[PDB]
């Protein structure tokens, strides 16, 4: 496996509604075409600790990082930057961890 486009940095607005996007990444299947376990890729850890980053599934082998809104982003208070790590994992089983850095913009 190879997590495509995910050593990377995201950007979410401060007063962002639940469901807004952060980043769009994909996954290469190690040229044996073993699909990904249906629950994966997921988020293992956040940098300081966080929820509301759920990794949804766009059509195909494209995934997306989406804030689910269970926790609110208030940049004028902390925290302001998050470093989520994404764990894609396929059928035969060969994990890949990659880190997505999320910054929260300062909505005036």
């Amino acid at each position: 496996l190879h997590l495509i486009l995910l050593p990377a940095t995201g950007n979410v607005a401060e007063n962002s509604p639940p469901g807004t996007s952060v980043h769009k990444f994909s996954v290469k299947l190690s040229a044996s075409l073993s699909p990904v376990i249906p629950g994966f890729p997921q988020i293992v850890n956040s940098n300081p600790l966080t929820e509301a980053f759920r990794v949804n599934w766009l059509s195909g082998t494209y995934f997306e990082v989406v804030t689910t809104g269970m926790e609110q982003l208030d940049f004028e208070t902390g925290p302001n930057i998050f470093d989520l790590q994404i764990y894609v994992k396929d059928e035969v089983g060969v994990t890949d961890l990659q880190v997505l850095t999320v910054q929260v913009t300062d909505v005036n």
Partner: protein
């Protein structure tokens, strides 16, 4: 997703249980990695270059994060390693992380000919520089990260010849 953003100058490393290939830099002074730095943007005016390169890796993380990385340079003619047991057989170094963050691998001048073409081809290719987790990256917290940078320069014995046009500049419009 990064070109045009300052975040295209660093990659994020973390604590992984098993060794991984973090980063690969094909020694091609026409590759957009080098062709945009001072080294590459000077060397691209010249058809040939012959000397030794310096690559200085720096880790920007907290003061409690430590880790060891293996910086390997696979000589010309050698396949891209894709395993640390294969990468460590070429010119490699191993740098710690503490009280000092920057470390330099001197990609030596290994070549058959006397000059290596700037626009990389298959006859004079320069090899690859791969960065591997030597033991890990251990941050002070569970999900800590570290951001690694890299600079390139030329050793005093680097030389160039056959000045030419640089492919790193274009003019499609007319300047008025």
């Amino acid at each position: 997703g990064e070109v045009g953003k300052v975040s295209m100058y660093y990659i994020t490393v973390t604590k992984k249980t098993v060794t991984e290939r973090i980063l690969v830099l094909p020694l091609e002074m026409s590759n957009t990695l080098f062709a945009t730095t001072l080294l590459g943007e000077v060397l691209n005016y010249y058809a040939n270059w012959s000397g030794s390169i310096t690559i200085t890796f720096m880790c920007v993380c907290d003061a409690f994060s430590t880790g060891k990385f293996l910086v390997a340079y696979t000589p010309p003619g050698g396949k891209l390693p894709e395993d640390r047991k294969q990468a460590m057989l070429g010119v490699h170094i191993i740098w710690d992380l503490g009280l000092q963050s920057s470390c330099t691998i001197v990609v030596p001048w290994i070549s058959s000919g006397f000059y290596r073409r700037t626009k990389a081809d298959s006859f004079t290719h320069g090899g690859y520089v791969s960065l591997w987790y030597q033991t890990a990256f251990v941050p002070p917290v569970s999900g800590g990260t570290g951001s690694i940078l890299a600079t390139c320069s030329a050793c005093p014995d680097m030389s160039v010849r056959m000045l030419r046009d640089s492919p790193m500049m274009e003019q499609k419009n007319e300047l008025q």
